[PDB]
């Protein structure tokens, strides 16, 4: 079979046995869609990912996209199309979907959940097909008028951009120079070079796709605030019919060649620069540029962290399936016994613990988004949690940075123990890992960097918040210490909390004291990464502690067979994070908590 | 030009801190002077940087191709040419014996040299290994068997060690390639081995010696049955060296890698095909194992070297990234969204992860030349004090660590390397991602980083009764009762070196109790690899903090310009480490104090 290692088990596991999702299926909004359907849909888009959409995964590396000046257009391998196809045909492009356009109402904790099987078959895949998702952020954005546009988008499948990115504005998106001209029929002609825009063209995957483009109006004011956003579509269309017409003037001029990700076309962008005008309209007829395309950024930086979270966790299972199968030396209990029988490297200790640490914090970081995503619904995080929406947008916010930044680092750094496990062997691309690897470095940099990730964290979802949402998370955490085969676990969540709280005091301290201080700012900036891994560990010890809560009482209650194994491995899971990992934040808290400028203070030169 | 030396750090080391010009001009060096070695630094720096780098893009991009028919493999055209460059410098006769047409050298300086075509094509320098392994099948020979090892020196060979076959990895004793042996004294040697690197290497040279690891008919199991042979891929005249008749010993294989791409990595078939493979029993004694030793002691080293040589121009190709790209405000005017923008080296964070490349980059160098000093007796006698046999325990003891801490510790700083440059740092435009492609095999070959701290833990230091670790021990305890502005330095480096004794003291613990409780034992395999990686941060503290105290003394004396600025940055990089890194090792320390067999009773099923 496939290289998509799936697990719909630890899925199911989590929105139903953990979170309660199931607790919302079959009323309200969700009226029409009930338990056992939302665990078919599961099953289902999970062999569609092992089969058809992992079918491309090698081709798309192997026989990259290919950029074709003389039309300005990117070809992508045949099989890759065809897994595209797939999904369309499916219509898995119509997840989440609002009704109005086709889509199937569902809680977003089981959105990501069906989304993340593609993640973890072929990322790209999914990438490519974000445009209905994107025409619906265009619909709640747009004019009475452009819903009837972006109306057409969804239902007609076109793709879709996210077009910020400039050579010289990639974090600093504020400093782009990209004008917009307003015409005297209201429309404007966009005047331009992005970079490193993903999926920018698709050979002939769609009829039409729609740039999402930030542009600086004529006399607008400076930075991210002076930014407006147009519609910009690669064809004129009809705007009653959907007809498509004449090629307007938004070209791909070159085609990145990447470490991984390679099926993913990453183009520089260019408007107005070769004889027509590129010709966009604005969102909502309103200048509200970086507010409106955040809903974007924010939908990209869940799929980030989730796609790091997929392909995690098909690494680990690859490198279970390996070590179970493979002979190599004695049992250390047998060392200097040259004649002992060889043995599988499951039984092996520095395998195991590195197959333990692989699976905890794979399942952690499901865990993780999971929870990060029962509070997106207003519905379920009232249902499952008891908070009211706005608590509830302000814990999703809080928790984004985390799954992007802290999904984003773990996957790639645990994926080396994935390889390990396979030996010598895990270097050769008969194996998927060295591509998983490869495929993920990128998932610490778009979307904004594992930097601006902890920048944001600090400053805006925690600072700016007043520690609302912060403040509920530390309390779940406390509930769950306060409450036997759990005293342990709950000791050191204990300890790794006070180190959290230690660290969050630390830095706030530094941050407060700026005022009479200035350059006390940096130890914030030294900080702020440190302290985001910090808080995605206790998360993650948290979360596997409440599961091996859960597979004590179905133990309890006399499971067995496959379903005990589960709940088993639950259990040391969680201690094992409890024991092994968690320690370490204390003396994190310690360094964070000595940091100083002499680093700031030091000549560039001296480096 | 992707490869940015540094000879000043080499020579800091060399010579102001480990005084190996000490030697130089006198004994085994007579006719070697300082100046000489500086000139011979400087000018295989600029070889590397020149025609050596020069193929380094070229080589991945368009790697080797095997005709199986042949059983020869293609390299492509400029990477041929940097190893003729390599040639005609005779920079493949490093170090190589006085007696074989090499300039006598300490092996500090010799290592220190191989670090540039290491860190500018390390797939030159493996073709390149065979004069040297020449010289170990030499030392090892009988008269004879000498005769031809001059020869293969000085016609320049190339060589392979050929160990691994698919089922005989990290237990090399499992292999099953058998010798018969003929009347004459000869022996047939008949398997197919695996993963053997150079095994062909197009017409770079008139000859290969493969040392072949093969079990004669009816010698007992495990490595200690096994004999070395001298198999060559061509028959020669043993007078004059004249080539002749083809041997039968054939590449049928050559595997697609992850990185490091231009290496041919080639399953190798011997007597496979109806022609025998000649080979000759290496001293005509029977002991492979411990012949082979020699060269893996070789490579184990040059691999460690390799994964230190790629950090150090991972960290310096971002350091001038950094120097030059502007994005973003300096976060002491944050909020104005017209402050000046700033070069990024200004941020905290990206100065953060810039130190953490410097410290790592500088304290691996450090790691490495600190080894290379105890491999000529003569060395450690004039800079250590330190006799014949404990400098070869000691040598012996760090051996493990440059293997083990240097390979993972520069692909997980790599990671910082490619963050520094964004988006760019995914892009192949930049060398970074090759860097961490390239450099990902140095945990797997020449030993896995667990057989590394097995080999560390049993044999170099309960096998050894703790002396070289306690002569170690002895230098930092030293070190630290020894100014006082580097006080804290000093209590840092206190606590971290209780804290790598509280885990030695604790793994010998469980050690004993496996005396009275056999699965005692697999609490040391759960935590030998940390505490290999314990051992080499202490030394990079260690000595990063002896270079700080020559750095303050070189200050006080009144230095000036550059000079200034590098021992600056050692007082910087050595406080930094002291105080970000080593302060984990408590918490490891607790970690591994803790360790219990749960992870090892669970059931596999459960993982
Ligand atoms: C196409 C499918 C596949 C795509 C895969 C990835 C695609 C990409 O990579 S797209 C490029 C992603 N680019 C980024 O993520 C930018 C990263 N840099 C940052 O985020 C910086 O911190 C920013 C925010 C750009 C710094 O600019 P500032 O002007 O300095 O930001 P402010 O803090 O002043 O906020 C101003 C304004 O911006 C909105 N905003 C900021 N942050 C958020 C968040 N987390 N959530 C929602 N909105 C945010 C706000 O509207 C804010 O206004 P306010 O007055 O402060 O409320
Ligand atoms: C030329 C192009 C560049 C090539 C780049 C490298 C390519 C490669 O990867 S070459 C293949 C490398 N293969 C390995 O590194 C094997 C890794 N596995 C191990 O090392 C295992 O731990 C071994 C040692 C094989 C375990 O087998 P055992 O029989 O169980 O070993 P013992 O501990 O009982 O000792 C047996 C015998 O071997 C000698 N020995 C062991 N360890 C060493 C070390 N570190 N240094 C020197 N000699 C060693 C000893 O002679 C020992 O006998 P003794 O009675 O204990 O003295
Ligand atoms: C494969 C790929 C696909 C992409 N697709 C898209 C797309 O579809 N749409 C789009 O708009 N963009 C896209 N991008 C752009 C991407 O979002 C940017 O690369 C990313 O936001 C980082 O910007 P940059 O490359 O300019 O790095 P820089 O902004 O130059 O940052 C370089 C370094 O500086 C650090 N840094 C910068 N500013 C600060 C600060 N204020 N404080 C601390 N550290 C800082 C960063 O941490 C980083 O380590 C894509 C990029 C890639 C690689
Ligand atoms: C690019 C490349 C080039 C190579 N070149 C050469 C060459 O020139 N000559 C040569 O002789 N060999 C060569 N090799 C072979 C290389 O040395 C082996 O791949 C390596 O030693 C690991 O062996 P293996 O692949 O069989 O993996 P395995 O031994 O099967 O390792 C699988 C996993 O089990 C673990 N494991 C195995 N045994 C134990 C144990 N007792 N205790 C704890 N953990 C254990 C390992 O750490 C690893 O995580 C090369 C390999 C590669 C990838």
Avoid at 13 to 35: I, P
Avoid at 235 to 250: A, K, L, Q, S
Avoid at 352 to 379: H, W
Avoid at 385 to 408: C, E, M, Q, T, Y
């Amino acid at each position: 079979m496939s290289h998509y290692k799936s697990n719909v088990r630890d899925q199911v596991f989590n929105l139903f046995e953990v979170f309660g999702v199931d607790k919302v299926l079959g009323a309200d909004k969700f009226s029409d869609l009930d338990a056992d359907t939302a665990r078919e849909m599961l099953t289902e888009i999970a062999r569609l990912a092992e089969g058809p959409i992992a079918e491309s995964f090698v081709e798309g590396d192997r026989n990259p996209p290919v950029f074709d000046p003389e039309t300005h257009t990117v070809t992508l391998p045949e099989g890759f199309k065809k897994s595209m196809r797939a999904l369309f045909d499916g219509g898995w492009d119509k997840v989440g979907l609002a009704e109005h356009l086709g889509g199937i109402p569902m809680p977003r904790a089981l959105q990501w959940a069906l989304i993340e099987h593609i993640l973890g078959a072929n990322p790209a895949a999914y990438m490519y097909a974000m445009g209905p998702g994107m025409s619906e952020i265009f619909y709640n954005n747009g004019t009475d008028e452009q819903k009837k546009w972006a109306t057409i988008a969804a239902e007609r499948g076109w793709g879709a951009t996210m077009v910020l990115t400039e050579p010289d504005a990639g974090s600093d998106v504020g400093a782009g120079r990209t004008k917009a001209v307003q015409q005297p029929d209201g429309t404007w002609h966009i005047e331009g070079v992005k970079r490193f825009i993903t999926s920018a063209d698709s050979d002939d995957l769609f009829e039409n796709i729609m740039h999402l483009v930030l542009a600086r109006p004529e006399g607008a004011g400076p930075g991210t605030k002076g930014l407006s956003l147009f519609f910009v579509p690669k064809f004129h269309f009809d705007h009653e019919t959907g007809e498509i017409g004449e090629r307007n003037g938004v070209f791909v001029t070159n085609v990145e060649h990447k470490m991984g990700l390679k099926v993913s076309a990453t183009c520089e962008l260019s408007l107005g620069q070769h004889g027509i005008p590129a010709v966009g309209w604005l969102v909502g007829e309103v200048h509200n540029g970086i507010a409106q395309m955040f809903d974007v950024i924010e939908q990209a930086r869940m799929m980030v962290g989730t796609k790091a979270i997929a392909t995690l966790s098909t690494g680990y299972l690859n490198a279970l399936e390996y070590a179970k199968e493979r002979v190599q030396g004695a049992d250390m209990t047998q060392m200097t016994d040259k004649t002992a029988p060889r043995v599988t490297i499951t039984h092996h200790p520095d395998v195991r613990r590195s197959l333990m640490t692989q699976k905890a914090y794979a399942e952690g970081l499901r865990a993780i988004y999971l929870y990060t995503a029962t509070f997106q619904d207003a519905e379920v995080a009232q249902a499952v949690h008891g908070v009211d929406g706005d608590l509830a947008a302000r814990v999703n916010d809080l928790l984004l940075p985390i799954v992007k930044g802290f999904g984003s680092e773990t996957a790639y750094a645990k994926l080396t123990e994935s390889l390990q496990t396979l030996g010598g062997s895990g270097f050769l691309q008969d194996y998927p890992i060295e591509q998983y690897i490869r495929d993920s470095k990128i998932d610490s940099l778009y979307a904004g960097t594992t930097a601006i990730q902890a920048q944001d964290f600090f400053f805006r979802k925690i600072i700016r918040d007043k520690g609302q949402a912060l403040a509920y998370v530390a309390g779940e955490i406390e509930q769950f210490i306060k409450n036997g085969r759990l005293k342990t676990e709950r000791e050191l969540l204990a300890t790794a909390l006070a180190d959290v709280q230690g660290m969050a005091a630390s830095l706030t301290g530094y941050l407060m004291a700026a005022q009479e201080d200035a350059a006390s700012i940096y130890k914030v900036g030294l900080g702020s990464v440190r302290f985001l891994m910090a808080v995605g560990d206790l998360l993650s010890g948290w979360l596997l502690a409440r599961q091996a809560a859960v597979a004590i009482e179905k133990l309890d209650a006399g499971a067995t067979g496959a379903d005990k194994s589960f709940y088993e491995g639950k259990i040391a899971a969680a201690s094992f994070f409890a024991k092994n990992m968690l320690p370490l934040l204390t003396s994190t808290r310690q360094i964070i908590e000595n940091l100083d400028n002499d680093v700031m203070e030091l000549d560039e030169a001296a480096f």
